[model samples]
Target: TSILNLRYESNHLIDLSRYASKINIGSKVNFDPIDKNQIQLFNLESSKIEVILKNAIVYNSMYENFSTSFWIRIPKYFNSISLNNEYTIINCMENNSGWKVSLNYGEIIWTLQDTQEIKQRVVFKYSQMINISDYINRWIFVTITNNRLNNSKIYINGRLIDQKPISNLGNIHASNNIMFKLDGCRDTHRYIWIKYFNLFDKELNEKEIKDLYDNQSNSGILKDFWGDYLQYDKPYYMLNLYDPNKYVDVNNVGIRGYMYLKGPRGSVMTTNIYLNSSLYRGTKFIIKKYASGNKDNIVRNNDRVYINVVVKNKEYRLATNASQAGVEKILSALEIPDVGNLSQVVVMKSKNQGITNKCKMNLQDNNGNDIGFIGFHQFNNIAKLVASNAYNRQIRSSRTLGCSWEFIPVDDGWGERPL
Candidate 1:
């Protein structure tokens, strides 16, 4: 449920000179945008986003035993729901019904339709102790444990609701190369606006679940696939669903890179904009100015570096020269002046050097295509807010002075294979 396409048709096409990038964008974005409007295909109240096959992440055997939980707020006066109107928060199913974590018909549950030879699913339901109607409107937490031995269990607000009668039988659809759908309907799983839905490779004890509910944050969970518990820096994948700009699942493995390939091939020019939260505020500012201006250029203080901004048709060409002219101009821009369709690429550099001579940059794509500027307005508003409440000291004390930081994961396998 994300999208894009690039049409090279325009008044002029310019160079995608990376030398124009001062961003030092050490990392790349891992995403597959099928549609902006389509992702909103689901009823706003139903679900607002999703990821289909090819573009979806696979689970495989590495996450056999996983724990999934979600925080939801059912309206106090919520009316009855249709069988087809149920919300399927997350799913990794393929056919009729394979593996799904859902809430429907007063049943907050997760069902495993078939695993191996057994097709009859083991439904995890809340018992009398946990009544679905009791949680209407107000917030209620729900969780489920998918054990490796085929056993499964359900929990409501950190308490056990029900579980599979037997052990040593359940598997959430073969070797984990799953579809991993989210938000809207797909297969047996339909759709819903679930605040958070997380999964971990290991089971979470009642105390831990209760703590999680009390804390009430995180779109979902991630476990195993890496180091230790306390400093367990990496999970299989962490999805901050509800948060904008952070929908992708991040972890230590299988995070695929994507390309903007919906339009004409060899469209003559391609501009790759790299952004890091470090330069987020600044980048957003400058791009807007250039995109909206009547000028052909935006220069930095030194004037040694620059982005020769130019717009054609609906596409923008941010031109630059990356020579080591005294001081280097490291920059990149983001989205500006909403136009027609858009196609962008997230790339990683094989080295930290001038992209000018290195036209050899990786713009190739997930298929092997290859691929900044900065801003300033945030300071004005931020400074005003701070002065209004002595918050300036709080901000100054919390952040570093000049330089910003970036996370350049070494093993993302950006361009894993050759096109």
Candidate 2:
């Protein structure tokens, strides 16, 4: 995994990995699940992404070498904007000193300003610099790699835009700093759509940078960025039994798994989970309390039912009846809000293996489905995913062993949409 990973596929604003201490969400920022693609909407003038670093010199310790990349859609209004404003793409600094990437007029400028007021600038000014309308309302890949003594490179859409040497004048004063800031430019009308953002402690080569840009069509962004964290050889969206002791054979018909539920009198309810993706218009998943264990009457009406969610090392009890757990009930347990009238629900999780990033989830419903489905993917042992102060402290304290989920509702149906 990289130093910092942020993908807006879920509602979470914090980093997917533990490198960042916390994330600050601006009031004007919002998440957009436009059908199959999930991106973040930001009024570049007010909305910004600020991540507090765990250590001040975390990236500086890399010998002043670091790389940052992201996918963004130019705001439609960029074509009508004036040339007087400067839009901030990203800044890594502390106490008003360090490096920054900004857009001045139509040029892409990367400046490293040390505490001594010394500045080393690398600017990219294309021949069609005056025609800003050509890049508006389109998906663009931007990457910047900083090598202290060597040449720093800037790329747009995986092609090298410019390269210049970053002078080794003074030290990069990032001590006691706010690690990274995205779109921190003050009040303006330059809104943008950010899809994926990544930060690495080391400089990525040209081939590696090209690979990152090419991964845009690889179905899932998280899978390509962090690596897949789901189980292998299983069908996507298939919920298997979470029998750690192997008490029951889940392969048999009508048997989901065996679990000691927290019912009225602490009984074991039915572990029957059936997800039929073969349907033409609608997908169905059932959780019936058809007890196949040694005891009957193990569950009663309105009795709390317990079941291992299996997506991660998390536990959930049915909020509704013991015999009937509806989709909303399951969504609540998965930490996905049921505010939108979604037609389908897809939940995913990485296997419980340590130090792994493989993840598996459902992206498509059956053929002929009218609309898209809501997606949920859980992190194995991540803390809160909020943009609050508590979330920052939790990550800094190195708190482990928790569950976090990302959710988004797509609008497009099963009409050949990418994951």
Candidate 3:
């Protein structure tokens, strides 16, 4: 009950608790799977704004502040002889004016200008480059924060690198516009694979940002960022036999809590879902599902099937068996995708009852969390005990949800993050 409330509060902060509007865009940006700790892929997008809020100042010294963060995998194929080039990551250039955060030349640059009647001079800006090029295909975390005070900070993977003043001439101003141009429209064409692009109106302190980068057990923002990514109009938390009334689907379609799905075993059939909500990797979840699918036959090597977990976007796998109408728990740690191009799905209402569990660690942060939620703790134990054997080879092997399982090296916390 306590953990449930914590998760809820994390999500509500993005839903209704905060006074800010958010939009996520890029061709590869997805709206499902709260956690898609997969690839350095393409483009995708989304944004929301209240009529009056659109007219109101977005950044004020006291109330309105902001933080923008994302994960980027440096291109694997940058030419060895390549000269310094400006690689735009998140650049908001609308109506001829706005702010930007990019890989300018060779640095991670963040620049913001106050726009009242006209966009003011460059007031807040910073540029930095993490010397991690010694390794290939490394994942980099970038976070920029501002509270409209005399300070603005930037962090690269939980470590603070630069801090700048919030006001130019010490006269702070508010911003009225918002636009997200991910990868700069591929104009200059970047080959970066970006993930978890989140914008928060709240100025997270070093502790919070560190929590996010520390490990999976305490990633307070990862779960909420996912809730925002999956952005449903309303709550779709429970999917059991005792709901008070009819369920409202994401499309606003009046429907049942259950859903049918395909894939994961030699048989692309056999599954029923009572929950459609997806939490990232660390959010501890115990989902229950009841059904009668795997119903029509097609019995292969292993046929008794009844459960389902969304392993990635449009990709699901059968975990347990019901062979009948039965409610079962679909844990998030187990539901996480071991693939980079895939996806945890979580959500709810109530402030303390929102998105709380860390959704990246297999069990908990590899190191640990504030209290710790254990990411893949059990999975790790079992996997270690049986590194490989029948139906398996080395570190990667298989059969459950059944059929040979492929143990792909996942970048998730257990493997996903240390947060």
Candidate 4:
């Protein structure tokens, strides 16, 4: 005999205090009026803006494959915003895959590289003139929100490029650890100057990203530009105009205007009529019952149909001789007869038998004459011996009436028809 105890409970709680301390980490540098090098970097506990890099030399002289990196802890609850990788420009004379910025998950989130291969060198470079000639100002940005419906974009100098989708490895872990690194697996002994860096909590849209790059306050020259040129001023106008919500209004109005004028006036009127008429239209016509057998001694298979209508004083016949293909063949067999002259043709079905019935024909002539014409009929009532059905089955049908003729004046255009 065996006893089973399915109840299970434990007073175990994973310690998450360490994870809580890693989020929303920041450092700032206050420039001293006396000595520029006398800069200070301090960590802030709850600031939304954080500086990841200051004017410092972060190079790996060991010539190792692994590059130097900096990590910052973001607030776990601050998962609604996106972040941009900021790099301050400083001149250096070493070009070998300059530097990369990425989010760390034990690795880098993205990497910025100069596609142009450069040999390693050690010289002080200015950010404004550094690899700006090449695509060296490239940076990677990531968002904390894991929304499949939303897309993450990479912007370079204000232009958005399609970025690869990030894996939803896990939620914004309690420890908001954002990593920045330079991978030198290929070469080593690289040097780069860091002016300042930051990670924004909100994702910058295309326009917002462009504004950030255009404005000096965001990623532009700081002390170096002012020291070099007296007229160099930070762009405050562009910064003030940058708003992510501005595009929202533009998009809504743009779509509204486009939808308002997309169709022709007549089409719009017809749509309105259709909508209003729907109530009165009531039930639609349904095929309740159809005779599959012969009608008036004409077998269904043998019966051919034709429709006759007169246009431009000439009567055109559209005949369906038993099969759909036969109807098209009949139409193709008929010639246009004349040029600059338009004629209307009626759809008709017929059979081996002569025309079964007669209907009133409405003909429009070139002389603007509305004539009520009479239709001629013919019938075919013969049982052809083709196949054996274990018994005798008779197949009889009708034929299309001979074609009629009419003439219409070239000047008199086809008029509208009555409802």
Candidate 5:
């Protein structure tokens, strides 16, 4: 039975390296720094080196039909060279049979039946100078069917060559052997350099063969077998800051930009943005009050006062015993929200001051209310705030109102909602 269902990870060399080594037949050699530029040479003594070359210009695996061909720059001096399983050599000098094919014991023989005579010696030329130069560096498929028709076909690059049909030999049996003899008996020598090679257990149809050649020749080394090099991990600075206008302008105060509080939000407003759970297990809010908008003056009375700051589906309420302490209470009472979508209208006034400035707010939930505060920071415009938690704290202030206020979102998950 024939082998099937084979898969593997392999590197095909396309890059050039300067290192080179020669290997004797039957020796298994591993090339160091497996790059494309280095050449690993093998001297065969009845064994061959199985190399996976990049951009294979010539290859054939005797699966469907058995054929072999390679694209190379031929040297001018050689009469013939053995390539793959075929022997190719120059034959102009001798009057004897131009070429010979025989079994190992010479029991079966096939001699070239010259239909026409040629006087000049066949010359080896570089691909660019040859008529078939367009086929150079291109994948050429070779097939040989040893059926009763005994057919051999050489596809230059990818196109089939039209020529006289070679003799048809019966299927090559396990005992049968094949070889390519190039250069007739003339003492001239030739050289060919190959880049890629492939072998298959089954014959590939025209479409599959063409696709194989096209993909191997055009794709990058990592992408050849459907592997992609694109990174999926998000970068550190990619977090989207929450702002009311949807424009993350860091300069605007009271616009409410939400970021994972990673450090102490004490005096400095600018610090490294952090989203980790351990550093800042919660969140903080800062608020500033102006003399023109003093709630005590507007109401003419002060008993207890409070201000609310809402962020990412959570709310923090700050209260003060007197009007002067309201601002500090607002800042100090900050906490992680429990829900995701955080939106609201924040009003600043003394429990004694009459109604004054009421700021319109939009809310998003912090995605949690019952679940404990376990923070997972995801930074993307696509992530939406769904819910939050709300709480109140008292502020201490002597002159202008001041208080700390903060609330934590109870959980770190979101429910789908329209944006």
Candidate 6:
């Protein structure tokens, strides 16, 4: 059973545990929705945003075997503070005898205080601590567990990163105050956001922790959506070719593109291009879907789907197995004219599937409005075309057929879309 399960839902902090414990919030705490089941808690300069649980709520708890988990996104602004300064993430103490978690510079320190007031602290390696900036702006899962019979463990993103033996051999007698992001290094101006704070009476094993992290929603799955265009008929157009003319020129304002690849040959023939023109370079494209056959074929199918972004002849590729859906950011920030470099996404695959049908995906802009569907239909087809027969001639060459491309200007808020 969970001792405390804190979730910021529907713009309000709710405790899902049976305890229905009350929480104290600071005036500066913000509850803006972030992702699906999370909220943004930003503490601006001179403002305090803390969650406190008094001793009465968690009485005589977590002093023995227990576990705590939470998700957080610590921005890079914390780097501006002095390295010697410590910022508390959580603190449970009666006087100085209790456990706390904090950040000293880039290091995360977990300390347990015994009856004698001596503190035992566990931390990441020096090299790992120095690189904490790498985690900035990304959702990070953290879990800390202690088993009196065994040891204490710290996990980041569900992977155990540190552990330490229990040398103090004494448990915290009582915790008068259980505070989060409060009472430690109040002078620091940095702000952070957190989600899903849970405290458990028993230590959770590795599998349980991994399951918690994996259960969160992901923005990468596109689900089952029909191609931009779909048609059923004979003389199948094996190459589902994209038509740029159907939609406005990519240069038009607020236009984004989603690319879809069908069967084996369809995957082989896919190539998305982005020119350096204002419409292409620095823009983002969504690889809407890639359906590799069933389980048996998926493992044996060596043919891959490729999304190559070529800029000034240099190419960067986002290649993967079937079923990938997410934003593929083109190399931006390069100083180039609107029409200078040639950047194209070359999506290629090799396989053979029966029938000829049209497939298309949608195109949109940054403001969350649909521009139009930019996709392709099948050209010609026989009942069945094997991989060997598909790539035999110039049919598989990019030189013979023009590449297709759809790009959306990078949207600042899209990243926050629910998974």
Best by TM-score: 6
Worst 10 residues of 4 by lDDT: 236-245
lDDT score of residue 42 within candidate 5 = 25
lDDT of 2 by residue, 1-419 (tens): 47777654355666676665577766756665332234444444445667776774254432557887876554332223434457666667666567776764446677776677766777765322221122433456788888877778888878888887765556667534332334544535545556577878778888999888866534322221111211211112221112111111111111232112111211111123111111111111222232234133222212211222332322222121112232211122322242133212233323222222222222222232211112221223311111111222233332222222211112111111222
Q: Candidate 2: where are CA atoms >4 Å away?
A: 35-46, 76-81, 126-134, 175-188, 219-419
In Å, residue 61's CA in model 2 sits off its true spot by 5.1
User: All models: lDDT?
Assistant: 0.30, 0.42, 0.33, 0.21, 0.24, 0.43
lDDT of 1 by residue, 230-317 (tens): 0111111211111112212111111121111011111111112111111011110012222233243322111221121222212232
User: What stretches of model 6 exceed 4 Å from their correct place?
Assistant: 34-63, 77-80, 125-134, 174-177, 186-188, 217-281, 284-419
- Reference-based TM-score of each model: 0.34, 0.47, 0.38, 0.23, 0.27, 0.52
Runs off by more than 4 Å, candidate 3: 1-57, 60-65, 80-82, 93-98, 115-136, 169-177, 182-189, 215-419
Q: What is the lDDT of residue 269 in candidate 3?
A: 12
For model 5, how does the per-residue alpha-carbon lDDT over 1-419 read when each residue is reduced to its tens digit? Answer: 11211112255332122211121222422232423322222222222232222223122212234322222222222112322222332111123312233211101122332223311111121222221122222222332112113333334335444323434322221211122223222222222223333333333445654554554332221110011110111111111122211211111123233323232221211122111111122222223232335432221112111234334434453221112222111112234242122222122222212121111111211231111111122335322221121211211222211111112121111111111
Give the higher-TM-score candidate: 2 or 4. 2
What order do you get sorting by TM-score, best first?
Answer: 6, 2, 3, 1, 5, 4
User: How do the residues 1-419 of candidate 4 rate in per-residue lDDT, one tens digit apiece?
Assistant: 00111111132111122122122222332332332322222222221222122222222221212111111221111111212222222111134333334321112233322324422211111121121111221122221211122333444334443453323221211111222222222112111222223233234455555444444222211111111110111110000011101100010111111001011111101211111101111011111112234223211222222222222233333211212121111111112242123222221111113322211122232343322222221113311111111111121312222222111111101111111
Instruction: Give the winner by TM-score: 1 or 4.
Output: 1
Clashing pairs counted in every model? 40, 8, 54, 44, 106, 21
55 in model 5: Cα distance from truth in Å?
Answer: 30
How big is the positional error of residue 253 in model 2, measured in Å on the Cα after superposition?
54
